[PDB]
């Protein structure tokens, strides 16, 4: 499936297989895409074992080449492939741990990924999972200013963004990661909305419609509407049934409405859920 080819190559040493990525450039108007400008500038500042390495960039007369670290598969495809099998908890725990490491690194280097989804998390035969695609990433500031609205693939978009938050932060990436965590457990997306309003309603039905108590200021947000149906919060054990006490604890902390209360990637790294983490190789052949 999928029309086209990609140049791949193997050398030796530690970083032997690499993939070539190429961009055609508009010479009379626009020039280098700003997405490429953000990904290249930011990615070259993010050398971490859980962040897919940008190894080189070649800017020719009308083309821009990106030499990346090569990885076998992506999480969406892995989950699709394991759709009827079930990913072992030890492998789920290892993936989450590693994703938190990679995310924490991004944040401590003032970069928001802003588009964390299974398709952007690449995996290899050794049990490693890495963050890919920083085309929508942005270098943030302290305090954060107002940035691009309604970012993040719908299914993984935090309610702050949906409610029109004037300012959003690192917490938008933790929400996405919480959705992916829940998804690795069932292989089915947590909140597959069909529109912005549908996405919000799905979140409210699962986590309950937020009030001023749960999320101070929620009812003053730009896109908040008092017409919102008031759903009751459901037993967290019901959100993802297979998850244990520790898993549910972490997930609930990752899906906290209040972005100022939602757990940080570095804080999550110390949660008892990881008390037994290891690095299993995938359960299916890649």
């Amino acid at each position: 499936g999928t029309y086209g080819v990609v140049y791949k190559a193997r050398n030796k040493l530690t970083g032997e297989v690499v993939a070539l990525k190429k961009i055609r450039l508009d010479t009379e108007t626009e020039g280098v895409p700003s997405t490429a400008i953000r990904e290249i500038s930011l990615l070259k500042e993010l050398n971490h074992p859980n962040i897919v390495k940008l190894l080189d960039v070649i800017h020719t007369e009308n083309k821009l080449y990106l030499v990346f670290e090569f990885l076998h598969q992506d999480l969406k495809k892995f989950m699709d492939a394991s759709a009827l099998t079930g990913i072992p908890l030890p492998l789920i725990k290892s993936y989450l741990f590693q994703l938190l490491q990679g995310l924490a690194f991004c944040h401590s280097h003032r970069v928001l990924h802003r588009d964390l989804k299974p398709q952007n998390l690449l995996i290899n035969t050794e049990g490693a999972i890495k963050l890919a695609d920083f085309g929508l990433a942005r270098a943030f500031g302290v305090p954060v200013r107002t940035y691009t609205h309604e970012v993040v693939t719908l299914w993984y978009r935090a309610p702050e963004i949906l409610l029109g938050c004037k300012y959003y932060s690192t917490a938008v990436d933790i929400w996405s990661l919480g959705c992916i965590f829940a998804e690795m457990v069932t292989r089915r997306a947590l909140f597959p909305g069909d529109s912005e309003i549908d996405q919000l309603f799905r979140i409210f039905r699962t986590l309950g419609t937020p009030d001023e108590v749960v999320w101070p200021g929620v009812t003053s947000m730009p896109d908040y509407k008092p017409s919102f149906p008031k759903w009751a919060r459901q037993d967290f054990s019901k959100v993802v049934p297979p998850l244990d006490e520790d898993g549910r604890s972490l997930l609930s902390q990752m899906l906290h409405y209040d972005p100022n209360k939602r757990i940080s990637a570095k804080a999550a790294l110390a949660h008892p859920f990881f008390q037994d983490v290891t690095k299993p190789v995938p359960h299916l052949r890649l």
């Binding site: 010479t27 626009e30 020039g31 400008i37 290249i40 800017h59 003032r110 302290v142």
Partner: protein, 258 residues
């Protein structure tokens, strides 16, 4: 969510020492001068205002310019081209909606062509090796503001005003780090508006004191004092606007209390 504030502050302190243009680079330029540079930067303040771009975008562009001029020889007729290319790159990097190339060509009163702006863009990226995520005086100020006793928008606007003035003059500002210029701007602005000084909480954070900031402060106070007589006036005009509480109109103190 102040969870990463310290990590970030430390990371920026590390990166600013790297993304720092050569202090005496202008001597190596066969044709351009500090005065031509002041002229270029001032026009960029105007361009930033015309297209309602962020102040960060302006600071980034100046960083790119100085780094490019720190290694590339440029004749006076290509200087505005480097400036336009740098602003385009900073807009692409920082802005939600960056102005199109045609808008940048227009704004130069049609001095260069679209293809030319793009080839220059190609050249700046190559020379800077795509390292565009540079720390700025603006990024540090933004962090220091979180230490106001209590928050004052007039202090913030005046501090931002002082930080921008530092951009115009390669001599002496090229010799100070963004974090230092930001410290001096915050203190001078705070002192001017409230009579208070560099907070001790900020000494714990930065490790800077008025003593370490002094040299920058002496320079900055003089710049602040002579500002109404400067050949370049786009920043002063910009800060007369009520958006910035008309802070450029305020009177600088005669002396400081160091």
């Amino acid at each position: 969510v102040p969870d990463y504030h310290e990590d970030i502050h430390t990371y920026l302190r590390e990166m600013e020492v790297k993304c720092k243009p050569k202090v005496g680079y202008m001597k190596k330029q066969p044709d351009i001068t500090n005065s031509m540079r002041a002229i270029l930067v001032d026009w960029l303040v105007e361009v930033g205002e015309e297209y309602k771009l962020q102040n960060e975008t302006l600071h980034l562009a100046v960083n790119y310019i100085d780094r490019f001029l720190s290694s590339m020889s440029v004749l006076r007729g290509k200087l505005q081209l480097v400036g336009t290319a740098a602003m385009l790159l900073a807009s692409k990097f920082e802005e939600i909606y960056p102005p199109e190339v045609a808008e940048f060509v227009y704004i130069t009163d049609d001095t260069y062509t679209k293809k030319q702006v793009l080839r220059m863009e190609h050249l700046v990226l190559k020379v800077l090796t795509f390292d565009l995520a540079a720390p700025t005086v603006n990024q540090f100020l933004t962090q220091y503001f979180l230490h106001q006793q209590p928050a004052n928008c007039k202090v913030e606007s005046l501090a931002m005003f002082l930080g921008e003035l530092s951009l115009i003059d390669a001599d002496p500002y090229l010799k100070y780090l963004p974090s230092v210029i930001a410290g001096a701007a915050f203190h001078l602005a705070l002192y001017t508006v409230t009579g208070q000084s560099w907070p001790e909480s900020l000494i714990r954070k930065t490790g800077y004191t008025l003593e370490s900031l002094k040299p920058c402060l002496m320079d900055l106070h003089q710049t602040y004092l002579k500002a109404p007589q400067h050949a370049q006036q786009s920043i002063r005009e910009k800060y007369k606007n009520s958006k910035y509480h008309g802070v450029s109109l305020l009177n600088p103190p005669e002396t400081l209390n160091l």
